[PDB]
Design a protein around this ligand. Structure first.
Ligand SMILES: [Ca+2]
Ligand SMILES: [Ca+2]
Ligand SMILES: [Cl-]
Ligand SMILES: [Cl-]
Ligand SMILES: [Cl-]
Ligand SMILES: [Cl-]
Lengths: 460, 104
């Protein structure tokens, strides 16, 4: 493919978006301006991403191309690349490519990015043995037998129907792998990938992690959204710094106790009632413990490096163990049983404070947390100690804003009324309980919410 | 107020990251997901305004991902917004401004 006479750019590059790009690459001022083969020979790299290109017809004349970026376009047919054998890197994620047969003879390729396309058949990749980086996630690939000979791969992903991982067996140079969202259960082959440093395997059907036992070079592991219960194997992975085990069925955290290099640990949406095994994980800056069965959190008291902590959707009454976590910047404990927030006054650098659906009646301990930018105090609820039923029965309102002033009730049950500080009822006969609600917008620092709730008053 | 039921950690990504791309940054979450199915989306710089698609979000899972290596000297921060809409077509949260900082 060679230009033998000065030819208009728009007659070489037929796609109108690619002609416009090439006009600029080639230093011209009109897409009808003529160019020669020596003009086209000057083009060794091409960054043509994000331009609405449908066809790359004309690339075939760019005889000196070594690198291309056609990502984020509308490419289908990639036939024009077939004879650009000097190509060593291709970026073509986010297109509509199905047939990659044109890539089969580009044997000098070391990097190939094809994620988010319409690829099913990867058999043309068999002869690309020089590949060290290959991205195939967000496709409809179900068979990786074509990858079996790509023994220089260091970075790899694929998707989304690859259940048989056996073809990875000889890819011992793999350092970074992502097999997320492939409905994979059997990860036994991974034991062979002894140089693996990062394994991402979210949203699969993994229950047996024993194959990871000998993968002691792992520093990053994500098994978020699987069916894990027994995590005993993880005790061997002492180089782990970033571990995600969220959305599983884990109860026994003892295997994690010796993983002292962990800085990020995600355990949300499990079956944890005992975090005593986490007490020695002092390098932790991020810890997620939401959606468990926690009550006692006293083991968290030594984790002084924590800047991000989730505890929402537990059964915690005593939040006080967070008082020593003075570096905390974001704290989330919506849906717990906390009434006493006195200890939070110690979290002077808190920015995000999410404390809705607790039993909080008094905001005064939060008054000085002026670095707050995001706040949540909705839907509190508690039951007062019982009082005696009388026809003209009154109780003191105990709901206090950040200023210390009482918050007037929004609603009062059984036709009751309010005048500060008493809520008074007029009941016909005996009733076992009355109630009231409150709803008050409030800002602390720059964080805004509605401090609201429902107070139940039993009558004996 | 603005926080609503959002659960988001601070987001920073080193420049010149090694593949494979796309890479998961954080899993954006709204606890309105306890009331019904929620669908996540992102708008702004690096999402639907230039450079488009540098950051993407997986609609059902909330996984915020980066699609390519970053360069601090080229863009040092991205100002994005996360959105959460129910299966009955209504926003369940106010959109949250997320500042992504590109580090060393
Ligand atoms: Ca959840
Ligand atoms: Ca740089
Ligand atoms: Cl270019
Ligand atoms: Cl979680
Ligand atoms: Cl600090
Ligand atoms: Cl909240």
């Amino acid at each position: 493919a060679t230009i033998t006479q000065d030819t208009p750019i728009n007659q070489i590059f037929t796609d109108t978006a690619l002609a416009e790009k090439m006009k600029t690459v080639l230093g011209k001022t009109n897409v009808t301006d003529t160019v020669s083969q020596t003009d086209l020979d000057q083009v060794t790299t091409l960054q043509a991403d994000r331009l609405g290109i449908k066809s790359i017809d004309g690339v075939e004349y760019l005889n000196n191309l070594t690198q291309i970026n056609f990502s984020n376009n509308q490419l289908t047919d990639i036939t024009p690349l077939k004879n650009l054998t000097k190509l060593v890197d291709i970026l073509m994620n986010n297109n509509q490519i199905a047939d990659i047969t044109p890539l089969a003879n580009l044997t000098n390729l070391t990097g190939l990015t094809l994620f988010n396309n319409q690829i099913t058949d990867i058999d043309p990749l068999k002869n690309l043995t020089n590949l060290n980086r290959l991205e195939l996630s967000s496709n409809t690939i179900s068979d990786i037998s074509a990858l079996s000979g790509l023994t220089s791969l260091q970075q790899l992903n694929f998707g989304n129907q690859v259940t048989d991982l056996k073809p990875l067996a000889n890819l011992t140079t793999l350092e970074r792998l992502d097999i997320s969202s492939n409905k994979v259960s059997d990860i036994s082959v991974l034991a062979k990938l002894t140089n693996l440093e990062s394994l991402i395997a979210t949203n699969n059907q993994i229950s047996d992690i024993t194959p990871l036992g000998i993968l002691t070079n792992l520093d990053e592991l994500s098994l978020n959204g699987n069916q894990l219960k027994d995590i005993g194997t993880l005790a061997s992975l002492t180089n782990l710094t970033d571990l995600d085990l969220a959305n599983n069925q884990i109860s026994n955290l003892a295997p994690l106790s010796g993983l002292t290099k962990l800085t990020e640990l995600k355990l949300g949406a499990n079956q944890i009632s005992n975090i005593s095994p986490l007490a020695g994980l002092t390098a932790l800056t991020n810890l997620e413990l939401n959606e468990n069965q926690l009550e006692d959190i006293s083991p968290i008291s030594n984790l002084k490096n924590l800047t991000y902590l989730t505890l929402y959707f537990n059964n915690i009454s005593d939040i006080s163990p967070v008082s020593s976590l003075t570096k905390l910047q974001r704290l989330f404990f919506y849906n717990n049983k906390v009434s006493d927030v006195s200890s939070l006054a110690n979290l002077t650098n808190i920015n995000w404070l999410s404390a809705g659906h607790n039993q909080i009646s008094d905001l005064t301990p939060l008054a000085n947390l002026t670095r707050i930018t995001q706040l949540g105090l909705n839907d509190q609820a508690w039951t007062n100690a019982p009082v005696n039923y009388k026809a003209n029965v009154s109780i003191p309102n105990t709901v206090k804003n950040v200023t210390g002033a009482l918050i007037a009730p929004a609603t009062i049950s059984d036709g009751g009324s309010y005048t500060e500080p008493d809520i008074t009822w007029n009941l016909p006969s005996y009733t076992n309980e009355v109630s009231y609600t409150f709803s008050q917008p409030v800002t602390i620092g720059k964080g805004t919410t509605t401090f609201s709730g429902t107070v139940t008053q039993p009558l004996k | 107020g603005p926080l609503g039921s959002w659960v988001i950690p601070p987001i920073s990504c080193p420049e010149n990251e090694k593949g494979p791309f796309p890479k998961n940054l954080v899993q954006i979450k709204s606890n309105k997901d306890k009331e019904g199915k929620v669908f996540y989306s992102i708008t702004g710089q690096g999402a639907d305004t230039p450079p488009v698609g540098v950051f993407i979000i997986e609609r059902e899972t909330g996984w915020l991902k980066v699609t390519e290596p970053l360069d601090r000297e080229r863009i040092a921060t991205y100002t994005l917004f996360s959105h959460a809409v129910s299966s009955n077509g209504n926003a369940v949260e106010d959109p949250m401004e997320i500042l992504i900082t590109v580090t060393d």
